[model samples]
Target chain A: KKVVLGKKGDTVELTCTASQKKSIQFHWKNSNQIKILGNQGSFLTKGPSKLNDRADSRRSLWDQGNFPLIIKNLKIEDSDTYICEVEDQKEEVQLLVFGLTANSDTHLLQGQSLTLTLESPPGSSPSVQCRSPRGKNIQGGKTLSVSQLELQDSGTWTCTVLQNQKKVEFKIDIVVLA
Target chain B: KKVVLGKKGDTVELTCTASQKKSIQFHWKNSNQIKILGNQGSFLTKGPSKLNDRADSRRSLWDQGNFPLIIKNLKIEDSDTYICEVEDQKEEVQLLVFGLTANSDTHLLQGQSLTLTLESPPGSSPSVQCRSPRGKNIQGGKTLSVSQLELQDSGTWTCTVLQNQKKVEFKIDIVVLA
Candidate 1:
C-alpha cells in the first residue's frame, strides 16, 4: 500500500493490502517508454539487448496482497512510476503506481560544495535562482547562475521558471552566518 | 556471489563473493553519507522518519562477500549507493549504480524555440552564450537570447562564456533551410 526503501542492486517489494483475494495485474513504467522490464512473479527481461540485466533483476510480484510487486537491483533507471492493477468481476480494476526517486530540496550551508542540477522532464529547461527573501533578483547571467554565496547571500533561495505558461517553483530556506 | 532479487515489502538477500570464508563487516551508505546505517547487520536510515518502518518490510541481507548487502521495499530514497566492506582490507567491496530516464535533443531549423539555461553551484554564476562556431557572439538579452531565431542565425549555434578567464562552451548544431 505504501512505498518503502531498498538499496541499489538489491530487491524491492511493493505490496498492496486488499480485504479479499482477487486477480491483480501489475505494470511498471520508467521515465522513458522504451522497455518494460517486470513480469508476473518475476521479471521477464529478454526482449531488448540494451536493457540492463540489473534493471530486470529489480522486479518481482505476488498474486495480490499488501506486498504485491517486488523490484530487485534498484537503480536510478528504476526511479520512475510503478503501477499495480486489480480487476474485479465488473471489469473494474484499481491501479496504483509508486513514483520513486531520492529526496530533494535538501538544504546545505554557504561555502559548502553543493551540486545544483535541473530535475525537469526532458526538453525543458529549469532555471535556478538565488535571491534575497524580499524578492530581489541578484545580478547573474542567464541559463546558469552561481555566486560565492556567503552567509549574507543566504535567504530564501528559489528555483522558478514559466514552462508552457505554468509557473513551476521550488524553494529552499537557507541560513548561513560566519 | 551475485545479488539476489526479491519483492517489495519482502526481505531480499545479497551474497558477496569473497576470496575465503571469513568474518567480514557490512556497511550501508546513502548517496551523501560516509557512515553505515548500523554496525554489522544493524538497520540505518538517512531520510524522513516515515522511511524507518517502511524500510523494514522492504530490506534484509545475508552472508559476507564483496556483495553482502540486502534491502527491502525499495522506495526512491533507496536509490543510492550501498557498500559492503570487511575490516582493514585493502580493496573493499562496492557497487556502481546505474539507471536511465527518457531523453531527447532537438535540431533547430528556421524559427526554432531556443531556451538557454545557465547553471552553477550555489555561490557562483555561470554565464551562457549563443554564438557562431568561429567565435561570433549572438547579440541577446538577459534571459531569452533571441525571440525568434532566423535561418541565418544557424551555423553551429553555441553557448559560451568566460569562467575564471577560461572559455567554456556548449554547442548545438543547427542547419537552416529555406
Candidate 2:
C-alpha cells in the first residue's frame, strides 16, 4: 500500500495499520541528505542527531493502535522519506516507508513578488538555477541579478542544482506584464 | 521569524533567532485540548515521566545550540500550537509559538465508500453524528456504528461528542448520488 505525505509549511498526518499483531519500530530519514526540521517520535535510535533539536513537540507511538506516529508544526526542510518497521516475535521484520516533497508548481501573476527558497542538508550548500523556456538565461543588470522583474522575463524557468557531479532540476512557470 | 508549517504529514522547522545571547529553554502546548506528540530539549522541573524506552522514539530535546525538535511519522492528532519558550539568566523568558493543521479540505464523493473513524483520549468515548437538513435526527445510532449510506441521507454530516455537556464537532461534506 502507498503511504501519503503532506508538504512542508503545512500540517500533515500520515497513517498506517499493521497487517498483524507485532512489535513495531518507526524511523524517518532524508534520503537526499537534506536537513529535516520536524519529527514524529523519540530520536534516540533514529538517524541524524543535528536536525532533531528543531521540533518543539513529542512524537507519540501507540503500538498496535490506529495511528502510530503523529507529527505537528512542519517546515519546508522536513520533506523526506519516513520508514515504519514492524518486527514480529519470531524476529522477522517488514518495512513500511513514506516519501514526501513540496508542491513546486504554483500560479504567479504579473507584478507579484515570489520568494524562491533553496534547501540542503547540513554542511552542504546547494545552488539555485533559473532559466526561461525560450532557452534563455534571464539576466538583470551588470550584476546578472533581477529584482522587481518585468513581463519580458515571463516564461517557463528551470532550476538546477549541481552536487556530487549530479544535476537535479526543478521547473517553474512565471507570468508578468509590462 | 515566522515559522511556516507545510502540508499534512510533513515535518516543520521553526528557528528562534535570539535577540540577545543567553541560555534558552523551550516549552510548547496545544491550543486545542489535544495532546502534542514529539518533543525535544529541556531540564524538566515538572512534566510527564521520563520517556527513555527505545519504543518511545517520538520525543527528545537537544543539549545546546539551535535546539531543534523532530517528530517522526505524523497524524492529524498532532495538530496544535507549539510554543518555544526561552529563559534567560535572570529567569526572564521569551516565547515563540506556531500552529499546524491540514493543508487541504478532505472531500468524499457520492457513493464513495469510506470508513469513518473516531478516537478519543483515554477513558473517553468519541461519537459520530450524521444529520439531515430535511429534519432527521441521525444521532439515534449508538456508538461505533457503520451503516450503508445513501445520497438523500446526506446534507452535511458531522462527528460530534458531548463531553461533560460540552459539544465538540468535526464536520465532513458528504455528496450522495443515486
Candidate 3:
C-alpha cells in the first residue's frame, strides 16, 4: 500500500510494478470498482470520469509503461483507493486530494479581506507556514487571514501545511483591483 | 445603494427602479467597467462574462421589465459593484459572494472529522451557528469541528453567521462512506 497526497488542480502519478516476467499489461481500478484504465494500455477505454475527462483537454489521463496512471487537474472525487493489478500481483495506492479555497473572491476590490484555513484528518493538528506574494513570510498558522488587502497583496500566496507527518503545499493567486 | 450577498451556485436579483414615466431602459455595468447588459432589454448583447455565461446554460442573466438584473450561478467574480442606470437615475448594488469549500473530501471514510469556520470582513468578529445533517445543532461557533464522524453525520450541514449586523447562511453537504 502506498499513500499519495495531492491538492486540487494538481497532477498526480501512481506507480505500480509487477514481479511477473511474462506479463506487461496493467489493469487499474478505483475504490468504486470502476475501471480507470484497462490492460489495453495508454488510454482509457471506459467512459469519461471525474478523474479522466478527455473532452475538456485541460484534464486528462496519461499512462506510463502501462503501469503508472497520471491524472491531471485532480478533484475531490479522485480521492480513493486505486488498485493496479498485473497478473495475480496487485498494488494499491490511497490517493487523497485536498483543497484550500478562499471564502471570498481572491480578486478583491482594494480594502477587502480573505481567510484561509487548513484542515486534516482527525487527531492531526495541522500547522501552516505561509508566505505573501512578495516572498515575505506572513503571519499564519492553521488559519491565516488578512484584512484590508492592498495591491501589494496581489499575487500568489503559498502555504505549506505539515499534518499527520506529511507535508502538503498549496497556493492561492489573489488579484487586488485598485 | 443596496448590499446583496450570495454564494456560489446561488441566484440573485438586483433591483433598479426608474422614476421616468415615458423612458424605461436600465443599463448595467460591473466593477470592471464592462457593460454587463445593454439598454436593448431582456438579453445580453455584450460578450460573455464570469458572472453571465450564456453558453454553458447553468449560469445566466435574466431581466425583469428591463429594470432588475437577475443572475443565476453566482461566483466569486460576481462580487463587485454593480451599477444599474435608468436614464439619469443610477442605482448601485454591492454584490458580495462568499464560500465555505471543504479542504478535503466531504465524503469521508467513516471516522473522519471535518472543520468549518466562519469568515467575515475586517475588525468584525463573526459567529457561526451550525446544525448537523439531522437538523440537530452541532458544536460550532467561529470554528466548528467534529471528530470520528459517523454515517449519521452524512447530510446537509447548515451554518448561519451574523457578521457586521448582517445574517448570512451557508450549507455544506457531507456523505460518509462506510
Candidate 4:
C-alpha cells in the first residue's frame, strides 16, 4: 500500500514489478472490476482500453514481463487506491492518492450565482475568506454566496480558511471549458 | 469494512444510501487505488471509465442520478475490499469479499501426486473420502495425500469433517480436464 500527496495537477507515476517477475500477465484492479491488463488483455475482461495503464516510464511501464503505470497530469479526480495485479505471482499492491484536505473545486457559467461552503474541522470554529482572482476581499463566512457572477469574477477564487489554528488555503476553480 | 462469505462465482450485490442525495456522483474504489465513477463524475475524480461499473440491476448501477453497482461472475480472485465515494457529498463506503470457509478447488494431471488439505470447523476432526461420478472409494484423510492420481481420481472428492458430532460435508473439485 502506498500513500502519497500531490497538488491539483501533479502526476502520479508507478512501477509494478511483481513478487515473481516470471508472470508477464498482470491485471490492475482496485474497484472490484479489472482496470487494465499489463500489456494487452483479451481474457477475463470486457475489453481492453488505453486508459488501463499508461506507460510508467518514458519508454514504457512494461516490456516482455515488466509492468509500470504512468498517470500524468493528475487532477482532483485522479485520486484513489491504484491496484496492480500480475495474473499470478503478482501480489496485488495498493496505491492511494489523497488531495489537500482544504482543497475544493467549483465550475460556474458567467453570470451564474456561486455558493461555496468550507468544512469546519471537528470541535473548532471555521473562519473562511475568499479572493476574487483580482485580490479583492469577496466575502467571509462558512458559506460564500454570490447572487450573480461576472467575467472579472471568472478566475481562480481561493478561499483561505482558518481552523484549529491551522490556516489552510483552498482553491475554487470558477471556470471550466464548456 | 465488512468481511462477507460468498460462494465461488457468485455475484456480490448491494446498495448505498445517504441522508442528502443531492448531486451525488458516486465513485467506487477497492483494495487498490482504482476507482469506478458510478454514472459519471465530479471534481478530483476527472472522468468516468466505460470500462468499469458493469451491473446486475433493474435500471443499471447508475441511472439518471441514482447509483447502484452490480458485480457479476464472482471469481475466487475477487476477494477484496470495495469503496465508494460521492464527489462533494463524497462519503466513501468500504466493501470486501471473501470465499466461504471449508471449500476448496484442486486440479491435477493424471499420475501426478496430489496433496489436498481440508479446512475443518473449530474442534472438528477433518476426514475425507473421494467419489467418482459413479461413486468409488478413492481415498480418505484430513490431508488426502494420494500418489499416482488415476482417471477415477478425477471426480468430486468430499470431506466429511466431524464438528460437534455432526457430519459436515465439504466440497473439493478434483477434476483433471486435459
Top DockQ prediction, candidate number: 2
Name the top lDDT candidate.
Answer: 3
Q: Per-residue lDDT for A127-175 in model 4, tens only?
A: 6678877666766666667766777776777777553333446676666
DockQ for all candidate structures vs. native: 0.01, 0.02, 0.01, 0.01
**What tens-digit string does per-residue lDDT give for candidate 3 at B1-178?**
4555555666665555445222245567887777776545534355566655621210111111225566777665666788888777777877666655566555587889777765443323456677888756754555777766788988888877654344567777888889
Residue lDDT tens for model 1, B1-178: 1112222234443333333322345444444545443344434444443334443212232221233345555442343334445454332322211111102135655675555544332323334456754554664323434445677756666665433333334556655455
The CAPRI-style docking tier of model 3 reads incorrect
Which one wins on TM-score?
3
What DockQ class does candidate 4 belong to? incorrect
TM-score for each prediction?
Answer: 0.26, 0.24, 0.39, 0.27
**Model 4 over residues B1-178: C-alpha lDDT tens digits?**
2223233455554344333323345666655656653444433332344324444322221222334445666554554455655555443332332223322345567777766564432322434555445464555555656665677756666644432222334466676555
- List model 2 lDDT by residue over A18-78, tens digit each: 3332123433334453323222342333335444544322232222221233344555345
Model 1 error, position A67 (Å): 8.2
Per-residue lDDT for B121 in model 1?
28
> Residue B123 of candidate 1: its Cα lDDT?
26
Give me the runs in candidate 1 sitting further than 4 Å from their true place.
A1-25, A29-35, A40-46, A49-51, A54-61, A65-119, A124-148, A151-178, B1-178
Evaluation by lDDT, superior candidate among 3 and 4: 3
Model 2, C-alpha of B162: deviation from truth (Å): 29
Q: Is candidate 1 or candidate 2 better by lDDT?
A: 1
Worst 10-residue lDDT window, candidate 2 chain B? B51-60
| Alpha carbon lDDT at B153, candidate 4 | 59
